[PDB]
Amino acid sequence: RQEAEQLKNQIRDARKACADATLSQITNNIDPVGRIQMRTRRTLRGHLAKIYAMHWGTDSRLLVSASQDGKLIIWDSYTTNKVHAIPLRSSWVMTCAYAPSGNYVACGGLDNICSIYNLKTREGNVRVSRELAGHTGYLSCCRFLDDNQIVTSSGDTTCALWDIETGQQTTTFTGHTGDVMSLSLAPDTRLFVSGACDASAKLWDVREGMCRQTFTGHESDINAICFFPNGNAFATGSDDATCRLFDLRADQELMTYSHDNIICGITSVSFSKSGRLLLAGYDDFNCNVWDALKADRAGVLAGHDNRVSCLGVTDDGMAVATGSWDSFLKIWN
Amino acid sequence: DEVWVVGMGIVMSLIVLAIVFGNVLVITAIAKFERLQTVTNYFITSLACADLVMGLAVVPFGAAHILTKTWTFGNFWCEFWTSIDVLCVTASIETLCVIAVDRYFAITSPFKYQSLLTKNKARVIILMVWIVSGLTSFLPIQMHWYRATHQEAINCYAEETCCDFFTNQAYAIASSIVSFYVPLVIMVFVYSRVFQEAKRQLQKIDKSEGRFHVEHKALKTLGIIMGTFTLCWLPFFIVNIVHVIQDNLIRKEVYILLNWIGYVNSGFNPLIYCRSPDFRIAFQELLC
Amino acid sequence: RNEEKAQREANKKIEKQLQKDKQVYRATHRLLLLGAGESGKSTIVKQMRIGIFETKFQVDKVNFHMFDVGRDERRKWIQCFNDVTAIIFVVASSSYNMVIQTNRLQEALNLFKSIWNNRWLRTISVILFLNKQDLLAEKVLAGKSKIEDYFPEFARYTTPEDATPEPGEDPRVTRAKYFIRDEFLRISTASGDGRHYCYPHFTCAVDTENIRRVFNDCRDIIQRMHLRQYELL
Amino acid sequence: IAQARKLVEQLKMEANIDRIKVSKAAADLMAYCEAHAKEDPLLTPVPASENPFR
Ligand SMILES: CN[C@@H]1CCc2c(ccc(O)c2O)[C@H]1O
């Protein structure tokens, strides 16, 4: 245990020595984005109960949402129509994902099983493709590496890489002390980071299977995770009111986003297409928009009767849709 | 004297403004926010719409009559205004009765209440209430079934400069019953049952947690709900039934004063049926 | 062209299906079976039956849905059970002298305090089942570990003036039962603000009338919620 | 026992890495944001004619 303490002290000393100047100092001369006003262009209605997860399709037109009613609805954002409505075996759902090819939709939750639904099937409109089992905890978040590979983050404090065709875990990632609550894939899909309740965000390498870096940051749990569009940075959403941005190469936090008035937690974090705006939800009914490079609040998104539990920015950056516990999906622009 | 007329006009204008502002604010709060859109709030907005209609049509023209002492508009407009007045009053009172019945079903049968009330059912109930209110007002007034065969009444119906209310026994009794007396009985039985339920819940709580620190509120709320409806409208319908029998003469001023006391119930209603914290937050967001 | 008509038809069919599902979902209540291990949750669950475990039972033509979860002290899935009709809390009242290191009853009290003061589970009433009454009676009646030895406040405790006993009972077992009950009730009363209450029940493995108790507790919960919503309570 | 050795090895693996100065990383993030600011519909108000949702 003495060697571990020495290694941790050496890592902290190296990080402190590497920090030349804070990102706030360098971005002083950058002009602020100014006040941003956003309006609810379209509101999606039909969900019976509160909504946890959402995912924007690669086409930037289709999005899928999950609710406790057991209905997994695929919406057409442009026409505000329901393309599909998939029932679920388990009413309690905590995650959902939409495959890049647009043919598969992943779901999971307290059922301890990740379910993949085949949207391409014509004999049956929607049906379960695989029943991915092996986790001993609730699946917090699932994401699609490809049309055949999926990575999930469960309450077993382990993230696993699954193979849909075979139906069994190809690789499992261990090291988190607490439950894993969020997961996001890097654009190249070779790397991904998973936030955990252990107040630490860890970076994983998919092919090697070994943890690479770990960022301490704040002390509360991490509920939301999201990479920068560049792929060399990511931001976390804490149970404390602080949102923090970390850099993989510098291996330390660059800037923390917090306000004196805000005391509630963060449930969803996503970046804009250019990365200039960090759109983060909150336990408070209103959402917030932060200037990533300056930690200056630009706009506030309000209009949800309950807490915001989902948020995402579409691939082309045209719109942002936040799914709150009010059983309503609101698309902003 | 001269000052008295100005004072009455100022009071009437203030009443018109208060009613219009209150009901418009309630309807706007219900419409703007999807949170407030609830099955019981459909009945609430039906009541608010009825109150707004009355305070915009019957109250201003009635004030113009009482100040002017004559009816400047045509003979058709007198009948139309009377029909609008009766329709609005009946719709408001029966909507109060429907709200009471909805609360009775909510507390009395909690399990079945969530199933046998639906948005379609609420719309059907509101449409039926407005249809019942219309048949009592428009059908008799427009087809001259309310007109009574009296010398003074026949003279009044002739000259277009005079527009008062003279009615036969049958229509008066039927309208009074349908508008106020059946809703009174239904509401009294409803609120007695709901008070019994609240009381028994209170003694059950006391039995469960008597030693630890954890019906004034129920009595106060029921008084604020029913007493203001009884006090505002009961005298008017009582004197209606009295002077229609004509066994005890009732002066026209005594009738008009009680009718306007009934009118102000529309303005009073938003302060009674929209005290919820959600409604208060919506009002605070709307204005300042 | 035809794509708009096809989308409209699909949306209309899906909306009708979701309306039927809305009726079915609003017509059914949901409960959470939350309790410490080895406290008899399996036996009581089987009594109502007549990764997650979902059992559906209906009484008086009213559908109840119960979900039992089965992994650490920290609970972040507990936020998923907001708006449930009631939380059923089964405890081993007989376990006042046990190692769960720590007294099992004290661990149950800590769990009750955590559940009561949780921000997400606010406005949710807890149905409390003091399971294993017979074992508690056997322990207290016979010579065994004293309650005062493990719970210091038991020495100053006295039987409440209500003193509602069963048809056959002993003073000592009644004192122990009521002390255990008022511990939970004292934890419950302080933090509550009238939105949610705690319903205590003394039950045993032999008893099979827990369906009626759960039904009555749910009826009272919904009635109290409706009464407080309209400000008559 | 065995867990401590695994944790120590994991910490050793993360310790041996190359870290670039924070100035370079901040410059890279600033350059990326400045370069891609022209193609961000959220940051700058897109015309209503080209906006798909309106
Ligand atoms: C012109 N004033 C009318 C006359 C009779 C009447 C009123 C209200 C409700 C009724 O059911 C009535 O029959 C009064 O507002």
What CATH number should be reported for the domain holding residue C108?
3.40.50.300
Q: Residues A255, A260, A263, A267: what is their CA dihedral angle, to the nearest 10 degrees?
A: -40
Give the structural domain span for D17.
1-53
Ligand 1 within 6 A of B239 CB?
no
Note whether A305 contacts B: Cβ–Cβ < 8 A: yes
- Measured in degrees and rounded to the nearest 5, phi and psi for residue A306 equal -130, -170
- B interface mutation test: which of A305, A325, A327, A328 has the most B CBs within 10 A? A305
Give the structural domain span for B34.
2-286
Helix (H) or strand (E) holding A52: strand A51-56
- Partners of A305 on chain B (C-beta within 8 Å) are 33-35
For strand A81-87 and strand A93-98, is the pairing parallel, antiparallel, or unpaired?
A: unpaired
- Please give the Cα distance from B129 to A159 (Å, whole number): 60
3-state helix, strand, coil in chain D (%, to 5): 60, 0, 40
CATH of the domain at B59: 1.20.1070.10
Helix (H) or strand (E) holding A44: strand A40-44
Q: Which chains touch C (3 or more CB pairs under 8 A)?
A: A, B
Residue to mutate (ligand 1; options B79, B97, B165; most atoms within 8 A of CB): B165
- Please give the Cα distance from D43 to A31 (Å, whole number): 13
C209: buried, middle or exposed (CB in 10 Å: 19+, 13-18, 0-12)? exposed
Of A41, A247, A292, the CB nearest to D25: A247
Count of domains in chain B? 1
Pick the residue whose CA is nearest to atom 13 on ligand 1.
Answer: B175
Ligand 1 within 6 A of B89 CB?
yes
Q: State whether residue B51 is helix, strand or coil.
A: helix
Structure tokens at C33: 């079976």
CA neighbours closer than 13 Å in the CB half-sphere of residue D26: 22
- Please give the Cα distance from A122 to A124 (Å, whole number): 5
- Partners of C185 on chain B (C-beta within 8 Å) are 208-209, 212
Give the structural domain span for C190.
1-233
- Partners of B35 on chain A (C-beta within 8 Å) are 305, 326
Pick the residue whose CA is nearest to atom 5 on ligand 1.
Answer: B86
Note whether B35 contacts A: Cβ–Cβ < 8 A: yes
Question: In 3D, which of A52, A119, A112 has the Cα closest to residue A85?
Answer: A119
Residue to mutate (ligand 1; options B51, B66, B175, B254; most atoms within 8 A of CB): B175
Cβ atoms of C118 and C190 closer than 8 Å = no
- Measured in degrees and rounded to the nearest 5, phi and psi for residue C89 equal -110, 105
> For chain A, what are the domain ranges?
43-332
Query: Do C18 and A112 lie within an 8 Å CB cutoff?
Result: no
CATH homologous superfamily of domain A43-332?
Answer: YVTN repeat-like/Quinoprotein amine dehydrogenase (2.130.10.10)
- Partners of D27 on chain A (C-beta within 8 Å) are 26
Structure tokens at A201: 């965000």
Q: Report the residue of chain A nearest C82, measured CA to CA.
A: A50
Ligand 1 within 6 A of B266 CB?
no
Structure tokens at A16: 């402190």
Query: In angstroms, what CA-CA distances link C196 with A159, C84, C85?
Result: 38, 12, 11
Count of domains in chain C? 1
Query: Do A254 and D42 lie within an 8 Å CB cutoff?
Result: no
Largest CA distance in chain B: 75
Residue to mutate (ligand 1; options B53, B240, B254; most atoms within 8 A of CB): B240
Which ligand 1 atom minimizes the distance to the CA of B179? Answer: 11
Query: Do C25 and A50 lie within an 8 Å CB cutoff?
Result: no
Cβ atoms of C39 and C95 closer than 8 Å = yes
Structure tokens at C38: 């080895």
Q: Report the residue of chain A nearest C68, measured CA to CA.
A: A110
- Measured in degrees and rounded to the nearest 5, phi and psi for residue A42 equal -140, 140
Cβ atoms of C47 and C12 closer than 8 Å = no
- Please give the Cα distance from B154 to C166 (Å, whole number): 80
3-state helix, strand, coil in chain A (%, to 5): 5, 45, 50
3-state helix, strand, coil in chain B (%, to 5): 80, 0, 20
